[PDB]
Design a protein around this nucleic acid. Structure first.
Ligand SMILES: [Mg+2]
Ligand SMILES: [Mg+2]
Ligand SMILES: [Mg+2]
Ligand SMILES: [Mg+2]
Ligand SMILES: [Mg+2]
Length: 195
RNA sequence: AACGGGGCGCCGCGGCCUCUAGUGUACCGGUUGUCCGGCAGGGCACUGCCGGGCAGCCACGCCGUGGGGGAUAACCGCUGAA
């Protein structure tokens, strides 16, 4: 359909200061600061008009189609994650599951290393991005923390992907005559806030 | 079975001549028939034939011949509204 005018409002929580800067004809840079840190997000080439009103972020589209109107809900959802990111933080939880070979997960500096995955001599090494903290709880659980939910979720997804074999190395998911097969890996199990 | 780690080929490409192999009517030797009287030296038999062989050329010989980065394909995912 067609939208003459549509508006959305995102209430800024207490202690959070939001700055909106126009870096181009339709580009925006939104800086969000809270007790837990500062996030910076870019909204480039966008039809959404972004503005501040006494403690809210106002999002508007004018003369918009479905494509442009759909971006109001998206930007509201992104901004809400930013506000919760600087007040409560984001924690993604992962579970280590093995069948015969116990995996050894350790964090050394800014490297996350997984050893003995399926008894392989190769070592899975991942680079931990700035703003992400990884802690290994016992032998079964991994926790990824940060203020940028996109950054934190993406890294947690990378850990899970690193243990998913592809091509000729992919094991059969089901066993003989239909039981569970070789299902080893690290699986993202859920998320929650730090506070 | 596999990832990872270690070692080496085959095919192709580019060079090289130290080794080995081929050639080598440069060169040295042996020897057949005849002719120059004999010896020695030599002509011809299209290097007469046979053996060896430097240089050069050469392969059947030796040497070199890789990893990375970027954007992507098939797609797999994150966040994410309509
Ligand atoms: Mg050649
Ligand atoms: Mg000869
Ligand atoms: Mg004589
Ligand atoms: Mg004569
Ligand atoms: Mg002659």
């Amino acid at each position: 359909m067609h939208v003459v005018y549509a508006v959305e409002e995102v209430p800024i929580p207490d202690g959070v200061k939001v700055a909106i800067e126009k870096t181009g004809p339709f580009d925006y840079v939104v800086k969000v600061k809270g007790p837990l840190g500062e996030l910076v997000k870019e909204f480039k080439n966008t039809p959404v008009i972004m503005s501040l009103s006494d403690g809210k972020v106002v999002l508007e589209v004018l003369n918009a189609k479905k494509r442009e109107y759909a971006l109001l809900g998206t930007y509201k959802g992104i901004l809400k994650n930013m506000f919760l990111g600087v007040t409560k933080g984001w924690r993604y939880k992962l579970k280590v599951i093995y069948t015969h070979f116990p995996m050894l997960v350790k964090v050394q500096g800014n490297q996350l290393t997984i050893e003995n995955f399926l008894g392989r001599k190769s070592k899975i090494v991942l680079e931990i991005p700035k703003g992400v903290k990884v802690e290994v709880k016992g032998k079964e659980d991994i926790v990824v923390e940060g203020i940028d939910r996109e950054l934190v979720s993406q890294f947690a997804a990378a850990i899970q992907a690193a243990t998913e074999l592809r091509g000729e190395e992919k094991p059969s998911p089901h066993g003989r005559e239909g039981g569970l097969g070789v299902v080893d890996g690290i699986y993202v199990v859920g998320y929650e806030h730090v506070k």
